[PDB]
Design a protein around this nucleic acid. Structure first.
Length: 118
RNA sequence: AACUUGAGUGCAGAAGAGGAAAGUGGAAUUCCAUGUGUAGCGGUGAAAUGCGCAGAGAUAUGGAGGAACACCAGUGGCGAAG
């Protein structure tokens, strides 16, 4: 009645940064059902940056997504991390049917000034 | 004192991020407001300060302002250089 959204279609946003991978999964209108951050499975340091943490994060996001009720999601990957391609195969291998890869990484049109390099 | 080649005007054409002033646009960063939602986010080689249970990050819809103009974009162009 509040969180058991029986909906056939959804979308999964994979914030795949360089030292985390947050896999949230939601409906079409963006109201979030659940996430799984890669630091919420006990991975610390550069263990979040491994694709195994993104793989297990897509597994434990898809468990809560399928108990809320989802059968087909689209995917929106965001970020140049390492766990971009492994997380969609972990989402497909956990029972959800991934259809569209609409990659939305935010590119400015020479917008704000970037941070200084190392 | 003549001449027309140098130089300059005319006529017919040509291209250009050349300059100044004003207006409009879209993406992105940040902040604020709201909806969803739970325990982390960010960071490093390693962790900590920092933010977050007053509900942060993530996502969605807006609003605010400021700065710079992805692709085009090229040993391309323009300007005396900057």
């Amino acid at each position: 009645r509040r969180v058991k959204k029986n909906i056939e279609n959804g979308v999964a946003h994979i914030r795949s940064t360089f030292n985390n991978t947050i896999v949230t999964i939601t409906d079409e209108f963006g109201n979030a059902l659940s996430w799984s951050s890669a630091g919420a499975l006990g991975f610390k340091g550069s263990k979040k940056s491994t694709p195994f943490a993104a793989q297990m994060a897509s597994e434990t996001a898809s468990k809560s997504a399928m108990e809320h009720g989802l059968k087909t999601v689209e995917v929106t990957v965001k970020g140049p991390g390492p766990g971009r391609e492994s997380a969609i195969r972990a989402l497909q291998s956990a029972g959800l049917e991934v259809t569209a890869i609409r990659d939305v990484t935010p590119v400015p049109h020479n917008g704000c000034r970037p941070p200084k390099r190392r």
